PDB file of C-alpha atoms in Angstrom:
ATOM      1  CA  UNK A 509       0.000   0.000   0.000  1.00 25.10           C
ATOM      2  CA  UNK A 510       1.273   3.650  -0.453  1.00 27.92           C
ATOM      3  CA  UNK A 511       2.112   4.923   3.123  1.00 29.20           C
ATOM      4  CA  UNK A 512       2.884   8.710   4.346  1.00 29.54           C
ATOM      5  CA  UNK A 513       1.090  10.214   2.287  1.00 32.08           C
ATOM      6  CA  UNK A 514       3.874  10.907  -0.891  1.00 31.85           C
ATOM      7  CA  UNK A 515       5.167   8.345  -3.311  1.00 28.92           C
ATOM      8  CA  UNK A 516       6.302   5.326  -1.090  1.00 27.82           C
ATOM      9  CA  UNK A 517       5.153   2.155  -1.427  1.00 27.70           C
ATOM     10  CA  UNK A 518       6.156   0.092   1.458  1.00 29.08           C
ATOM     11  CA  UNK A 519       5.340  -3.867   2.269  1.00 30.73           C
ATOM     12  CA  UNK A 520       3.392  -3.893   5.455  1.00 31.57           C
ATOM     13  CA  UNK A 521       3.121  -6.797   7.949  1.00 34.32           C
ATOM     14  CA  UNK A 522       5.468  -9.971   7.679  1.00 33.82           C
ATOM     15  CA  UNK A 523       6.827  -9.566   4.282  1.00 33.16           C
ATOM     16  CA  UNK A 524       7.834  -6.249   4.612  1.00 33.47           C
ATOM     17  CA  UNK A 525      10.159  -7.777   7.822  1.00 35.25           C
ATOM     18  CA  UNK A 526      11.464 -10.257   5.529  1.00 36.91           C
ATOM     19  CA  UNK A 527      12.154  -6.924   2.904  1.00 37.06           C
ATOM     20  CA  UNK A 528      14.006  -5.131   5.832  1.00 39.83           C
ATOM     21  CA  UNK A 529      16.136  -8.021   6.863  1.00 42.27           C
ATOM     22  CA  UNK A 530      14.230  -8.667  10.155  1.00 42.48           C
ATOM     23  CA  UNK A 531      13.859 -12.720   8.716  1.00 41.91           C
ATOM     24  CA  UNK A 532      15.511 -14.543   6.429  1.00 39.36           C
ATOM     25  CA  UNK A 533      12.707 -17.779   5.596  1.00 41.92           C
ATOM     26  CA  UNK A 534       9.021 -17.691   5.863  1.00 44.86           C
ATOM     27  CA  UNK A 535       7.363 -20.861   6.743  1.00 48.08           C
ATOM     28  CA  UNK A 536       3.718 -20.206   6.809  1.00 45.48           C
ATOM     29  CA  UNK A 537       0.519 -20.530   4.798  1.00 45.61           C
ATOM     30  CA  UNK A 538       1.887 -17.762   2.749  1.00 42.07           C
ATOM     31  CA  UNK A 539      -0.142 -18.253  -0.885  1.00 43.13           C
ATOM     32  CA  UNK A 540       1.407 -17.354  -4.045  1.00 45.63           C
ATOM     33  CA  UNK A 541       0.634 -14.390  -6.112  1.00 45.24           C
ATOM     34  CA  UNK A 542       1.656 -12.427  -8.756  1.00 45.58           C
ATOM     35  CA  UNK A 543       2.567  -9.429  -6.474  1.00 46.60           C
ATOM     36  CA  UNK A 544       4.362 -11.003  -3.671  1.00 47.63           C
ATOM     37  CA  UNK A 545       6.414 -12.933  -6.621  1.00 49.16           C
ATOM     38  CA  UNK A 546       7.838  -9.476  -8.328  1.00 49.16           C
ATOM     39  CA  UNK A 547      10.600  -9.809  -6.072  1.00 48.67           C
ATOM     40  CA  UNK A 548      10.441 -12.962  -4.383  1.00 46.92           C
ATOM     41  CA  UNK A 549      11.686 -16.516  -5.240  1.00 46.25           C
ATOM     42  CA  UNK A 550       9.094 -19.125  -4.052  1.00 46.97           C
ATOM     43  CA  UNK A 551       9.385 -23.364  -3.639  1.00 47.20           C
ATOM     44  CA  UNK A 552       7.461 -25.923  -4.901  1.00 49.52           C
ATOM     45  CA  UNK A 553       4.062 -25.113  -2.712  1.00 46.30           C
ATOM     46  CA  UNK A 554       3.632 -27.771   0.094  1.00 44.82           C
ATOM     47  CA  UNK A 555       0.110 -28.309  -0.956  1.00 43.21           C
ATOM     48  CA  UNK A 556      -2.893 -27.613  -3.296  1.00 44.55           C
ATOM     49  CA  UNK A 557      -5.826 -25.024  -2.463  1.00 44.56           C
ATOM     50  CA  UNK A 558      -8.540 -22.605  -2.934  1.00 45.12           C
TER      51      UNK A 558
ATOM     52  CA  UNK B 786      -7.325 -38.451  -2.769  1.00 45.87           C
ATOM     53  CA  UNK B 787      -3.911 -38.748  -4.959  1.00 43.88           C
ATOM     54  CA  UNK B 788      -0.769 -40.167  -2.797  1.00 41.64           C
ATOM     55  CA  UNK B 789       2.000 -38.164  -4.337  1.00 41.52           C
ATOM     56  CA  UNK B 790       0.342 -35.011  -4.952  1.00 41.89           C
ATOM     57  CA  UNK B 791       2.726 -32.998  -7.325  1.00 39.51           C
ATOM     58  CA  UNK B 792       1.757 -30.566 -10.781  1.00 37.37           C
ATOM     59  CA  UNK B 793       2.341 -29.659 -14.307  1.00 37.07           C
ATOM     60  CA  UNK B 794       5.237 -27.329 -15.368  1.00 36.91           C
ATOM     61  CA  UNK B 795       6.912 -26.302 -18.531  1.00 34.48           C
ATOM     62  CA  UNK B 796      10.198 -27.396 -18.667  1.00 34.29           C
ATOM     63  CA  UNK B 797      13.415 -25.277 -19.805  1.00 32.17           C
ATOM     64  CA  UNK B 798      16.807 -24.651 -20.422  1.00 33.17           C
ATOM     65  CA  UNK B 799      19.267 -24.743 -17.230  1.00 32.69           C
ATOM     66  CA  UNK B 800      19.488 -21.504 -15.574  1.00 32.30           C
ATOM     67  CA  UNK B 801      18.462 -19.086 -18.659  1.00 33.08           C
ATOM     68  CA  UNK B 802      17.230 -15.747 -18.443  1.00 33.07           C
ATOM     69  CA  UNK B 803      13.319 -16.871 -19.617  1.00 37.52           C
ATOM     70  CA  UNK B 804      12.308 -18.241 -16.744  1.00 40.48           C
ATOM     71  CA  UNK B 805      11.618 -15.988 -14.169  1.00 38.41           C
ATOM     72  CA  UNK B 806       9.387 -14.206 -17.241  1.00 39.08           C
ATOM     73  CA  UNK B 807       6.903 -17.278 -17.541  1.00 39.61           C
ATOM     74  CA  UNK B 808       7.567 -17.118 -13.981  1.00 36.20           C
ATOM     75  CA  UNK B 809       5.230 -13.959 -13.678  1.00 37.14           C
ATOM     76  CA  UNK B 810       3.006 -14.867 -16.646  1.00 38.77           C
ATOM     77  CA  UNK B 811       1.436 -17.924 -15.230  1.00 42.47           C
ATOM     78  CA  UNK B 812       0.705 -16.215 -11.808  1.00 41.81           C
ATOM     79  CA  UNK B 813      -0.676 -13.129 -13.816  1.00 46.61           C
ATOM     80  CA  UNK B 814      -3.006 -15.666 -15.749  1.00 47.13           C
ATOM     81  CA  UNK B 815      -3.997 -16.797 -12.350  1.00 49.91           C
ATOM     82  CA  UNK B 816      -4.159 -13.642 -10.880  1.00 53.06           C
ATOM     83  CA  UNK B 817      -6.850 -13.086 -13.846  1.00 54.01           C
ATOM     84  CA  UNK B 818      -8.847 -16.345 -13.418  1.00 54.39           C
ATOM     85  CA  UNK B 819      -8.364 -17.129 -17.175  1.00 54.95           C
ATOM     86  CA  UNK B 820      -7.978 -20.579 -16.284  1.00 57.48           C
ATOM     87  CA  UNK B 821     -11.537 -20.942 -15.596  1.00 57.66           C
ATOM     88  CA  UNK B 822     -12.086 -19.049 -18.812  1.00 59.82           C
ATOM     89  CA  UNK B 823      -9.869 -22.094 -19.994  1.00 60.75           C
ATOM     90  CA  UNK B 824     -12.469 -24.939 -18.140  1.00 57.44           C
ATOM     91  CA  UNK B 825     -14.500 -25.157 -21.667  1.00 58.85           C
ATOM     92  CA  UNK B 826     -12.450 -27.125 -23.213  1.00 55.83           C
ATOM     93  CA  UNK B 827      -9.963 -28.599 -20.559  1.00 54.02           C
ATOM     94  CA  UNK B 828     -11.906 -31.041 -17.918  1.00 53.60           C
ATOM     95  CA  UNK B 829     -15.767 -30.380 -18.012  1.00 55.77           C
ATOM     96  CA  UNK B 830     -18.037 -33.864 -18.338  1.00 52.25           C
ATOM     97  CA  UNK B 831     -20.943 -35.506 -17.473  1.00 51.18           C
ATOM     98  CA  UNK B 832     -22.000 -37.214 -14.388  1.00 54.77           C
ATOM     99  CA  UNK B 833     -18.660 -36.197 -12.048  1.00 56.89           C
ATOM    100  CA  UNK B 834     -20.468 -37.759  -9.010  1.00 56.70           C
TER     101      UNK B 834
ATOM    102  CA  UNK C 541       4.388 -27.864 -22.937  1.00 54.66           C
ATOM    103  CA  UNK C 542       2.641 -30.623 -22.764  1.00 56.92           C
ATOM    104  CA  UNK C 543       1.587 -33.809 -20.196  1.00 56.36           C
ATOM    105  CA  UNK C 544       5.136 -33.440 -18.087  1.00 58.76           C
ATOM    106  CA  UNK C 545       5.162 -33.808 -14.717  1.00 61.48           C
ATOM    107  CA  UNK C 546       7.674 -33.097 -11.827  1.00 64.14           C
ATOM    108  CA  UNK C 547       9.539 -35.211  -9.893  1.00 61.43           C
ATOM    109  CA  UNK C 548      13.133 -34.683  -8.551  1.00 56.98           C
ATOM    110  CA  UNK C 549      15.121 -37.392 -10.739  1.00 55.02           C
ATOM    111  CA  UNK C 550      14.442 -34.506 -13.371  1.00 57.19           C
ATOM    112  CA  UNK C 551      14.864 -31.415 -11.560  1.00 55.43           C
ATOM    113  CA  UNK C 552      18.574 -32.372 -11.480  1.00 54.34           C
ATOM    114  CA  UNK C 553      18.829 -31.683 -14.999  1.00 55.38           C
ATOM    115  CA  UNK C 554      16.052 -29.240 -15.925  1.00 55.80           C
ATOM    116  CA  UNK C 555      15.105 -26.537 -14.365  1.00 55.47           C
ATOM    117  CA  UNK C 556      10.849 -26.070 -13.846  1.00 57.17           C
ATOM    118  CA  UNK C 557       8.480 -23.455 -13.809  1.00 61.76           C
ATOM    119  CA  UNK C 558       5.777 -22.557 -11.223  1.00 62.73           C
ATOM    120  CA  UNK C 559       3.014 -26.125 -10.768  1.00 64.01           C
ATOM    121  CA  UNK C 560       0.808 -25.402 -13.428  1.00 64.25           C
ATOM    122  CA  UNK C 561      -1.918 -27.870 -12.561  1.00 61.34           C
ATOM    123  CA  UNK C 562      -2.652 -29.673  -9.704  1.00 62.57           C
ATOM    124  CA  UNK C 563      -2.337 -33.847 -10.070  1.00 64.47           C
ATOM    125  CA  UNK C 564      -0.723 -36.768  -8.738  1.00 66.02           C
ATOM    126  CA  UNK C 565      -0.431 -40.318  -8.879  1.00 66.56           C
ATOM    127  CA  UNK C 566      -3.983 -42.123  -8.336  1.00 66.20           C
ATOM    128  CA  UNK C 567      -5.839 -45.251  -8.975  1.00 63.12           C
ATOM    129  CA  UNK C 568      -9.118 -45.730 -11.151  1.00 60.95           C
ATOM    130  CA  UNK C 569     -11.267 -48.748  -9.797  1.00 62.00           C
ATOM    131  CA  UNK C 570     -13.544 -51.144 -11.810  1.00 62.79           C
ATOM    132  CA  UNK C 571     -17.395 -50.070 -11.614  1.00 62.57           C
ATOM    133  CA  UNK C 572     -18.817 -52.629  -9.389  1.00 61.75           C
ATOM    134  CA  UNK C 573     -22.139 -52.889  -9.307  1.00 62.17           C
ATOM    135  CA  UNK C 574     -24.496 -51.538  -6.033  1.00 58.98           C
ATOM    136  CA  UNK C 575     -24.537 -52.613  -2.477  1.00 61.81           C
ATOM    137  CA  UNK C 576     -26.753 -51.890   0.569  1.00 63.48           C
ATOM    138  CA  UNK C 577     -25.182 -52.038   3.936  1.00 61.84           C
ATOM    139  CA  UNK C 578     -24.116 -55.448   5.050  1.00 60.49           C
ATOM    140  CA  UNK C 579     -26.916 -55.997   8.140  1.00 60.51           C
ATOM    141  CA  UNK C 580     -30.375 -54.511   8.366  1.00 60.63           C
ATOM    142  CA  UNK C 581     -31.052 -51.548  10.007  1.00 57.53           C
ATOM    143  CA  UNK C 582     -30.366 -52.602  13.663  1.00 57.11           C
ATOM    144  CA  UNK C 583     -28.928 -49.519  14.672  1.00 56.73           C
ATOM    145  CA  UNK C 584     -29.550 -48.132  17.700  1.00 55.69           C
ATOM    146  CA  UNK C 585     -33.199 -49.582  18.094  1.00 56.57           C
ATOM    147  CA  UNK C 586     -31.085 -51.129  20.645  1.00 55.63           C
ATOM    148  CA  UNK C 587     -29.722 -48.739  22.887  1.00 56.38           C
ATOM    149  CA  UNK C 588     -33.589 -47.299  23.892  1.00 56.92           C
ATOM    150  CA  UNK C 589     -36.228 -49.320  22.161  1.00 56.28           C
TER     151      UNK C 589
END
């Protein structure tokens, strides 16, 4: 989402903690998208959903 | 139930460039739900239970 | 593209893309006929009546 009010996009919540080097692994029920993946190199996905 | 639940891919070349493309393109074609613009010809039937 | 699916005995060699569609290994049975339960109803009639 754009934050303080200007031109910054920043990643809220857990990915942005993996962004800023607060983590180096998620292991969650973290789905796939085409948004999460501009930058970030996913597995093989545990599982199949909906 | 399936025992060894894996997928589909498209195979390629060993660590070229074109990968991480496709990469996207699939995930924007599910990010546009043309695959179930893609069911009328792919799996429909009659009498699935 | 095509039927091709993933396993690691390939992955060695070939690189993959994102799982395209979801499948597995399964196992089609014959198409026996129909069959009712094997006792009569004598469920629990028992426990009250």
């Amino acid at each position: 989402e754009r934050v303080q009010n200007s031109n910054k996009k920043e990643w809220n919540g857990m990915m942005g903690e993996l962004l800023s080097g607060q983590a180096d692994m998620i292991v969650a029920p973290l789905t796939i998208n085409n948004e999460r993946a501009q930058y970030i190199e996913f597995s093989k996905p545990f599982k199949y959903q909906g | 139930k399936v025992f060894a639940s894996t997928g589909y891919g498209i195979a390629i070349q060993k660590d070229s460039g074109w990968k991480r493309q496709v990469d996207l393109a699939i995930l924007q074609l599910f990010g546009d739900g043309e695959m179930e613009e893609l069911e009328a010809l792919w799996l429909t039937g009659i009498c699935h239970n | 593209v095509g039927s091709l699916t993933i396993n690691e005995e390939r992955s060695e060699v070939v690189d993959f893309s994102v799982p395209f569609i979801e499948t597995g290994i399964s196992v089609m049975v014959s198409r026996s006929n129909g069959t009712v339960s094997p006792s009569a109803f004598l469920e629990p009639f028992s426990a009250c009546v």
